[PDB]
Amino acid sequence: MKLPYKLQDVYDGESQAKFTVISTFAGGGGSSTGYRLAGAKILCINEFVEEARKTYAANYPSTPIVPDDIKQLTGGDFLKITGLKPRELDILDGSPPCVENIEDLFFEFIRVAKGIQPKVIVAENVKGLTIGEAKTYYAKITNAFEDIGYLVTSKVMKSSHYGVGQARERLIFIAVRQDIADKVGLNILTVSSLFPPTSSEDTTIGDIIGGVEQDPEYIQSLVDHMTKSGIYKKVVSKMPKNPKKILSGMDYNTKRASFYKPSPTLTASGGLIHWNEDRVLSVPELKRIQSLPDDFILTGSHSQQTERVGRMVPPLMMKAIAENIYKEVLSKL
Ligand SMILES: Nc1ncnc2c1ncn2[C@@H]1O[C@H](C[S@+](CC[C@H]([NH3+])C(=O)[O-])CC(=O)[O-])[C@@H](O)[C@H]1O
């Protein structure tokens, strides 16, 4: 897909209804958006933050929303909600967030997937890990998917290889029910073919940012709030404009984006500096960098909107993932 696009293209793709998806940890719906673009019928979502639901519902008013804490839910609950039998769901989606006990919602996700028995699981993992925990933890995740009867593969994907002007790198698991994997012929040596081919060679901000609608008064107010603030006086005022590379505020975290590089990763805290203007990036720019449609509705305060975009999987990368799963697995059934 090419940027920009609008919600109506998402609805058009969704109207194909070529495979079924449940999106857990649905957020504002970055993942859902990409599934819908690839032809998915979103059967329902799970999302327990009120403002994420308000944003999701504003863009996708038809999609049923389960508001519960995932810890209170079973796969059978989802099956009952959507009218499905086990094994019937095509894709279960999730991006769980994040001595004393610390909850791990990724393992809550696995527990729910055990009840649903989806044909395919797509799960991004963003657990912050100590040294000496990371590799052992991903091995525990892999074993856990195999325990519930799945062939599983994993890879760090960089969204700028799939048309998104952002260097967002996150580990994504794809797992296929052993049943389905056998029918389609997937094995340990072909399983990595579930990850989509790379379409670009590091899409930059410049490649995708052209033509964003944006009121100069709103943009000016961003510059004004910036210029009269501490991080400007101490850091940003010392950062060159139009950099040829991402700049770190510690060489002068606060980072300055470059027009000629993929964007710095958008995060929930959202502190990225525009490449040209002494101000943070705007919500319209963040939407475009995230590869959302231009008319995507975000609710709440400026800070809540930046957070909601920051926590997303870029729709266009998830579109690539969903297309590839449909061609390589679901279209053979
Ligand atoms: N216990 C819970 N129960 C239900 N929902 C929860 C729970 N805990 C956190 N959440 C919610 O799961 C989402 C995780 S973000 C999803 C972005 C999506 N992939 C997107 O493309 O927009 C990614 C991240 O924050 O790491 C948030 O919206 C939380 O409110």
Domains and CATH numbers, the chain: 7-204+312-332 (3.40.50.150), 205-310 (3.90.120)
Q: What is the sign, positive or negative, of the torsion defined by CA atoms of 325, 327, 332, 333?
A: positive
Q: How far is the CA of 245 from the centre of ligand 1 (A)?
A: 31
Give the bridge partners for 263, in sequence order: 166
Cα-based torsion angle of the residue sequence 294, 156, 37, 29 in order, rounded to the nearest 10 degrees: -60
Number of neighbours of residue 44 by Cβ within 10 angstroms: 16
CA-wise closest residue to 302 among 110, 8, 37, 51: 51
DSSP label at 171? E
Block residue for tokens 């940003």: 236
Pairing state between β 120-125 and 150-158: unpaired
Q: Ligand 1: which of 22, 24, 25 to mutate, most ligand atoms within 8 Å of CB? A: 25
Atom of ligand 1 nearest to the CA of 315: 21
Distance CA 279, CA 302 (A): 14
Q: Is 126 in the pocket of ligand 1 (CB under 6 A)?
A: yes
Distances in Å between the Cα of 15 and the Cα atoms of 10, 12, 28, 37, 307 are: 9, 5, 20, 9, 29
Atom of ligand 1 nearest to the CA of 30: 21
Number of neighbours of residue 193 by Cβ within 10 angstroms: 13
With 0-12 / 13-18 / 19 or more C-beta atoms within 10 angstroms meaning exposed / middle / buried, residue 52 is buried
Q: Is 27 in the pocket of ligand 1 (CB under 6 A)?
A: yes
Q: Is 29 in the pocket of ligand 1 (CB under 6 A)?
A: yes
Number of neighbours of residue 27 by Cβ within 10 angstroms: 25
**By the 8 A CB rule, do 42 and 23 touch?**
yes
Q: How far is the CA of 73 from the centre of ligand 1 (A)?
A: 15
Q: Rg for the chain (alpha carbons), in Å?
A: 20
**By the 8 A CB rule, do 161 and 202 touch?**
yes
Instruction: Report angle CA 252, 255, 261 to the nearest 5 degrees.
Output: 115
Where do the DSSP E strands lie in 110-149? 120-125
Number of neighbours of residue 169 by Cβ within 10 angstroms: 12
Q: Is 97 in the pocket of ligand 1 (CB under 6 A)?
A: yes
Block residue for tokens 């998917």: 145
